Amino acid sequence: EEPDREKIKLLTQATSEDGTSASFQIVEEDHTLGNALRYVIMKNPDVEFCGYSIPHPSENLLNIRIQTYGETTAVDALQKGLKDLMDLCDVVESKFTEKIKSM
Amino acid sequence: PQNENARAEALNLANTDSQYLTPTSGSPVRGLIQDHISAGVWLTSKDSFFTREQYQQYIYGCIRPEDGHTTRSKIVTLPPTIFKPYPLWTGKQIITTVLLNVTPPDMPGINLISKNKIKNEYWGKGSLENEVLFKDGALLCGILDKS
Amino acid sequence: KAQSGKVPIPGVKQALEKKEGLFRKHMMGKRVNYAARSVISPDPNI
Amino acid sequence: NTLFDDIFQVSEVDPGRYNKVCRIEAASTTQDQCKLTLDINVELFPVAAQDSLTVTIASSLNATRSWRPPQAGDRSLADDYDYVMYGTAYKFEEVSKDLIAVYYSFGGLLMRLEGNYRNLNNLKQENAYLLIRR
């Protein structure tokens, strides 16, 4: 049994005890996913604040901060934005497969 | 330096934050130089409208509560200046927001009347974008420059 | 205050009086441990 | 709470070095004194010369916590009109006897009215919802 505990690190110094406002810290990520994830998280009707931020160009880090209104924590809203980004990549893959099979 | 009688004196006496005004005339010697000057003339301009997802990004692009930039442990924002056709924020309202978060919550906002370097006739007829106006910590008029 | 080929042997008095010597080179102007120098570079992300 | 309402006859639309913002000089149709200098986001709300707008300054829309983007079944006073702005008053200049002017700044887009009776209802409040129909 071996998970990976460096890839995502919730920063408790800026995380509300309510859970509805947290600041995550990914390693080895940048504008690639952090702008794709910020887009899909902001489509949740319960999200009040979302933004990604790279602290310095040197280290490969990524901070995204979700604040919700209520009845959904930011950890609960981080993972809805990861499934809908997983579901969106399957739509694009299912359309780009048809059109290659349409030539 | 190598002892706590010198760490305390590089943090309280010879640090850069106390060296803001020079002792020759009391003029400030620290500030933004070339391309930050020429971005505030675009950001605090009157064409600058930001949507909601763009508004939340520029605040957290500069202010990060994990590093300790906020004083409220949670980013507070403002209502937009345009409601009905589409909700939009103006570029002067981002400068209001970043002053709303870095200043302590107990003290009231800054009240300032000043001038720019940019004359009013470069903007057009009846423009007042030379008189800078802060009223309770809110940029209400005029762009920001080297001045 | 002695006689010298072209530049004679330094005496103990003349080991003391210029920018170099002793009293300004090694008493006001010592070299230090725990120091470093390098070329500087611009950064808006600090 | 409606504070001020009239109907204005727009006389000038000046773009003036801006691609999205026009300055609007409008004189009123009922009162023969009150004028209007306003900056509107002309990409959202296109205004021509010799138009007729219905300017309404409201105190709120109908003591909540903050703003929140709209959702299912909410109904507000902004649904009546076509263009809503929000901002503060910063300057009350008295021009002469009974020409007391007010100055609004909607996040940098300015407005100057000029009237006489409106001390009943134009305080220097942080809230001045400004609304335009037609």
Question: CB of B12 within 8 A of CB of B4?
Answer: no
CATH topology of domain D1-134: OB fold (Dihydrolipoamide Acetyltransferase, E2P) (2.40.50)
Considering CB atoms only, which of A11, A16, A50 is closest to B66? A11
Question: CB of B74 within 8 A of CB of B52?
Answer: no
Residue burial C9-43, b: 16+ Cβ < 10 Å; e: rest? eeeeeeeeeeeeeeeeeeeeeeeeeeeeeeeeeee
Considering CB atoms only, which of A16, A49, A53 is closest to B64? A53
Give me Rg for the CA atoms of chain D: 15
Going by beta carbons, is chain C in contact with chain D, meaning 3 or more pairs sit under 8 Å apart? Answer: no
Question: CB of B107 within 8 A of CB of B134?
Answer: no
Q: Which helix (H) or strand (E) holds A26?
A: strand A21-27
Mark yes or no for CB contact B56/A13 under 8 Å. no
Query: CA A49, A53, A59: angle at the middle one, nearest 5?
Result: 155
Q: Are strands B49-50 and B89-90 parallel, antiparallel or unpaired?
A: antiparallel
Please name which of B90, B104, B99, B98 lies closest in space to residue B142, comparing C-alpha atoms.
B90
CB contact set of A100 (below 8 Å; sequence gap of 6+): none
Mark yes or no for CB contact A52/B60 under 8 Å. yes
* Whether D78 contacts chain B with CB within 8 A: yes
* Whether D85 contacts chain B with CB within 8 A: yes
Question: CB of A54 within 8 A of CB of A31?
Answer: yes
CA pair distance B44, D108, nearest whole angstrom: 8
Domain ranges of chain D: 1-134
Mark yes or no for CB contact B82/D85 under 8 Å. yes
User: Domain residues for A34?
Assistant: 1-103
What is the structure's resolution, reported in angstroms to one decimal?
2.9
**What is the number of domains present in chain A?**
1
Question: CB of A44 within 8 A of CB of D71?
Answer: no
Q: Within 10 A of B59 (CB to CB), how many other CB atoms are there?
A: 25
Residues of B in contact with D23 (CB under 8 A): 124-127
Q: Within 10 A of D36 (CB to CB), how many other CB atoms are there?
A: 20
CATH class held by domain B20-147? mainly alpha
Experimental determination approach used: cryo-EM
Residues of B in contact with D39 (CB under 8 A): 46
Q: Within 10 A of A4 (CB to CB), how many other CB atoms are there?
A: 7
Half-sphere exposure of C5 (CA within 13 A, CB side): 4
Residue burial D58-81, b: 16+ Cβ < 10 Å; e: rest? bbebeeeeeeeeeeeeeeebbeeb
Largest CA distance in chain C: 65
Q: What CATH number is given to the structural domain containing A44?
A: 3.30.1360.10
